[PDB]
Amino acid sequence: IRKILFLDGI
Amino acid sequence: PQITLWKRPLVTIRIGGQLKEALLNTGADDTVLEEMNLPGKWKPKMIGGIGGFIKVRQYDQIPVEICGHKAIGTVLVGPTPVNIIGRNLLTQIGCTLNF
Amino acid sequence: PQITLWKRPLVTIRIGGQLKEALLNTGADDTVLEEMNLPGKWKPKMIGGIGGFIKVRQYDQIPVEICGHKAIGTVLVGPTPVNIIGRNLLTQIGCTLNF
């Protein structure tokens, strides 16, 4: 579950 | 230093008297940490990932030490599978991508 | 080149003769691109991050050009919110994090 850590702050 | 990417770029960060392993994430706009009480007022926020959005608490002006480098800024707290150091703090320690 | 992080680190990549904008993501083990048909067989796979899992199509040994630098590796295709270049290809073009 921690392979793709893209994170959008909006 | 120069951090290669053969393995996840995890580093130790210090907040108050708390130590935690966090990932230097250029793919994250903000910094989000796994469960930890912070002082001050906090506002609810929704952040998006690859699979959807999660709810987090937004705390501002939090001092954070990253590899001996001081940084102060917004820190989010919620159910992230990994502690993440986002661009908001990476810029403060002068971190860049090079190739 | 040297990329700072005040803005999202977006670069142009070329794959299968098509130009696309992609995010250099040190927080991603793999490379995930938006839905598109690529030549060669593929296998179903599941990957996750913040928000949960998504189903993707895994293609192997795919040539990708990143800012003029060539790479050949695994590319996942699926409903990702943005095109993501992960460490599997970042290491191939010799990308490092520095500060």
C70/B39 Cα distance (integer angstroms) = 48
Burial class (CB in 10 A: 0-12, 13-18, 19+), B44: exposed
Classified as helix, coil or strand, B66 is strand
- Which amino acid is present at B62? I
Which residue matches tokens 């680190």? Answer: C9
What are the residue ranges of helices labelled H in C7-98?
A: 87-90
How far, in Å, are B5, B99, C3, C12, C97 from residue C23 at the CA level?
15, 15, 12, 9, 15
Spatial CB neighbours of B68, under 8 Å, sequence gap ≥ 6: none
C56 Cβ under 8 Å from any chain B Cβ: no
Instruction: Give one DSSP letter per residue of C16-82, joined into a string.
Output: TTEEEEEEE-TTBSS-EE-S---SS--EEEEEEETTEEEEEEEEEEEEEEETTEEEEEEEEES--SS
Query: Which residue of chain C has the CA closest to A2?
Result: C49
Amino acid at B79: P
Yes or no, beta carbons of B27 and C28 under 8 Å apart: yes
Q: What is the DSSP letter of C84?
A: E
Q: Which amino acid is at B78?
A: G
Joined together, the tokens standing for residue B46 give 């929704």
Strand order across the B96-98 sheet: B2-3, C96-98, B96-98, C2-3
Q: List Cα–Cα distances, B54 to B49, B73, C81, in angstroms.
A: 8, 21, 15
Chain A residues whose CB is inside 8 A of the B49 CB are 4-8
Residue located via tokens 């299968």: C16
The tokens describing C67, both together, are 């800012």
Those of residues 1-10 in A touching chain C at CB distance below 8 A are 1-8
Type of residue at C79: P
Mark out the alpha helices in chain B (DSSP H runs).
87-90
Ranges of H-type helices in B9-86: none
B84: nearest CB among A1, A5, A10? A5
Resolution as reported, in Å? 2.0
Q: How many CB atoms lie within 10 A of CB C54?
A: 21
Q: Which residues of C55-88 are buried (b: 16+ CB within 10 A; e: fewer)?
A: ebbbbeebebebbebebebebbbbebbbbbbbbb
Q: Which among C23, C49, C81 has the least Cβ separation from residue A3? A: C49
* Widest pairwise Cα distance in chain A: 22
Task: Give C85→chain B minimum CA distance, Å.
Answer: 9
Residue in this structure with the two tokens 């696309």, named with its chain if needed? C20
Q: E strands within B1-99?
A: 2-3, 10-15, 18-24, 32-33, 42-48, 53-66, 69-77, 84-85, 96-98
Asked if C80 and C57 touch (Cβ cutoff 8 Å), the reply is no
**Whats the size of chain B, residue-wise?**
99
Which residues of B are less than 8 Å from C23 in CB distance? 27
Domains, chain B, ordered by start:
1-99 (2.40.70.10)
CB B96 within 8 A of CB C99: yes
Beta-ladder partners of B96: C98
Q: Do B47 and C52 count as a contact with CB atoms less than 8 A apart?
A: no
